[PDB]
Structures are given as structure tokens and as C-alpha cells.
Design a protein around this ligand. Structure first.
Ligand code: QQR
Length: 167
């Protein structure tokens, strides 16, 4: 049993809710919150901008030190950093950004990072300002992630479309 509330169950291991991932993280304090990161960990907008703002920019400060030491992530890759006031840990995962021309097949590799964590709160990778079709992202999630994932979808209209079209 865990503290995630109000989710619709899609499969054995994937759950979904119309929720602001920032507000959900503040309330559950999950072991892992996933950030929709880019390779530079520049958290300017979308989910990343919102999570970073909620940390009062501490996420960005930590991220800048990470990049200065390690260099950029790979598209499809990830790193574990602090969850600050939102979670124990933040798993920064880089999905492909269609608006940069990145190969959508890398979306499966991106979701594979979730399998290193038993339970996660997450957004749909490559959705929103990353330009991919969220319905496709949900399908890849369900067909790739085997650990327990709680997906937060900010837009109510999109959430309803995601549920109603889910196979
Ligand atoms: O700003 C706050 N939260 C958030 C959460 C998600 C996002 C975000 O870009 N979502 C993506 C998005 C945006 C518009 C339409 C969409 O189809 C999507 C899919 C993405 C998602 O839903 O994952 C931005 N901001 N919280 C402050 C405390 C009030």
C-alpha cells in the first residue's frame, strides 16, 4: 500500500491522474519524482520549470554543479539528484524533444530509466513542450515500465482523452 490517491488504474503497474505534479509531489513526498529534463538540466519551462520554481531554484543550482562536473546527459538518459522539498530524489530523465528533431525511438530508452526505481511519480515523457504525441508516450510507458508508476497529467482535457483512448 502507498499514499497515492485518486488514480485510475490503467494496468498492473501504471496509474494515471489529472493533477499538477508539483502539487502532487508536495502532498505525497514520494521517494522519486521524475523531471522532464533536457541534457543541460536547464529547467526553464514545462514540467522542469515548474518543479524548479517550486524548489526556489535549488534544483537549478544543484543541476548546474552536476553539469559542471559530469557534462551533459544523453537523450534517453537520466541522473538521480535531490528531490529538495518535493521528494526524496528527483530522477531527471531526458526524453527526445521533437521540436529539436530528436529520434522518437529514444522515448523507450528514456522510460527504461524508470525501471531502476520501484515506485515513481512522473509526467508523460516527451509530452507538452517536448512535442511528442502524449497518447504515444502513454503507450510506450505502459509497454516499457515494469515498476509502479503514478502519472500526473496537468491538462484535464488531455487526461480525459488519454483515458478514453487507452487500449
Ligand atoms: O506549474 C505547475 N505545474 C506544472 C505541471 C506540469 C506542467 C507541464 O508542462 N505539463 C505538460 C503539459 C502542459 C500543457 C499541456 C499538456 O498537454 C502538457 C503535458 C505535460 C504534462 O501534463 O505532464 C507545467 N506546470 N505548478 C505550480 C504550483 C502551481
Amino acid at each position: 500500500v502507498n499514499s497515492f490517491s485518486g488514480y485510475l488504474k490503467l494496468t498492473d503497474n501504471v496509474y494515471i491522474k489529472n493533477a499538477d505534479i508539483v502539487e502532487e509531489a508536495k502532498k505525497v513526498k514520494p521517494t522519486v519524482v521524475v523531471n522532464a529534463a533536457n541534457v543541460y538540466l536547464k529547467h526553464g519551462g514545462g514540467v522542469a520549470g515548474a518543479l524548479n520554481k517550486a524548489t526556489n531554484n535549488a534544483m537549478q543550482v544543484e543541476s548546474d554543479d552536476y553539469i559542471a562536473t559530469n557534462g551533459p546527459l544523453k537523450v534517453g538518459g537520466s541522473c538521480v539528484l535531490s528531490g529538495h522539498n518535493l521528494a526524496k530524489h528527483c530522477l531527471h530523465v531526458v526524453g527526445p524533444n521533437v521540436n529539436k528533431g530528436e529520434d522518437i525511438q529514444l522515448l523507450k530508452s528514456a522510460y527504461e530509466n524508470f525501471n531502476q526505481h520501484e515506485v515513481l511519480l512522473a509526467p508523460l515523457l516527451s509530452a507538452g513542450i517536448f512535442g511528442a504525441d502524449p497518447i504515444h508516450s502513454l503507450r510506450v510507458c505502459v509497454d516499457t515500465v515494469r515498476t509502479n508508476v503514478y502519472l500526473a497529467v496537468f491538462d484535464k482535457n488531455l487526461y480525459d482523452k488519454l483515458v478514453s483512448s487507452f487500449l
